[PDB]
Amino acid sequence: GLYLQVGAFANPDAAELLKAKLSGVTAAPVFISSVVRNQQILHRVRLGPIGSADEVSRTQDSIRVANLGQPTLVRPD
Ligand SMILES: CO[C@@H]1O[C@H](CO)[C@@H](O[C@@H]2O[C@H](CO)[C@@H](O[C@@H]3O[C@H](CO)[C@@H](O[C@@H]4O[C@H](CO)[C@@H](O)[C@H](O)[C@H]4NC(C)=O)[C@H](O[C@H](C)C(=O)O)[C@H]3NC(C)=O)[C@H](O)[C@H]2NC(C)=O)[C@H](O[C@H](C)C(=O)O)[C@H]1NC(C)=O
């Protein structure tokens, strides 16, 4: 499965809001992965798993149309 990251935030409310907005533009699962980085909590807003490269492309397009960020492929850890 393929995964996108749409943003990463120190403010968890910003991450939750972006997650909620993304659910309106994609059918793929949207989730927050929070990690410790540089002595702070970083809330990463991600989606997937997406089943194909073509669906990834169209999902990136939909996110840009919605002005929700510049989504990039990531691999989960
Ligand atoms: C190759 O390295 C990887 O590059 C990635 C490049 O995309 C990088 O991901 C990005 O990481 C940056 C931080 O480094 C992250 O930026 C956040 O950007 C948003 C804007 O989209 C900020 O939000 C806005 O802030 C302004 C005021 O500053 C507000 O007025 C505005 O309302 C905010 N917007 C929203 C929607 O709420 C955000 O700052 C707010 C204040 C917050 O933190 O809550 C920035 N955060 C930080 C911590 O700086 C950007 O979103 C993110 N892009 C994507 C697509 O994920 C990778 O770094 C991230 C952190 C990661 O590792 O997961 C790079 N990876 C590594 C390992 O270096």
Numbering used by the authors: 266 to 342
Paper text:
In order to characterize how the SPOR-RlpA domain interacts with denuded PG, we solved the X-ray structure of the complex with compound 1. Co-crystallization and soaking were both performed in parallel and resulted in two structures for the SPOR-RlpA:1 complex at near-atomic resolution (1.30 and 1.48 Å, respectively). The PG-binding site in the SPOR domain is located within the concave face of the β-sheet (the “palm” side in the top depiction of Fig. 4a), presenting a short funnel-like cavity (15 Å long by a width raging from 8–18 Å) in which the tetrasaccharide is ensconced in an extended conformation. (iv) Several amino acids participate in the stabilization of the tetrasaccharide, but only the side chains of Q270, R302 and R309 are directly involved in the interaction with the glycan chain through polar interactions with oxygen atoms of the carboxylate of the lactyl moiety and the N-acetyls of NAM(1) and NAG(2). It is noteworthy that these residues, together with R311, build a basic patch critical for the binding of the carboxylate and acetyl groups of NAM(1). Most of residues contribute to the stabilization of the glycan chain by the formation of hydrogen bonds with the protein backbone (residues 271, 273, 275, 276, 333, and 335) or by stabilization of the hydrogen-bond network mediated by water molecules.
It is predicted to have two domains, a catalytic “double-ψ β-barrel” domain (DPBB; Pfam 03330) and a C-terminal SPOR domain. In the present report, we disclose the X-ray structure of the SPOR domain of rare lipoprotein A (RlpA) from P. aeruginosa (SPOR-RlpA).
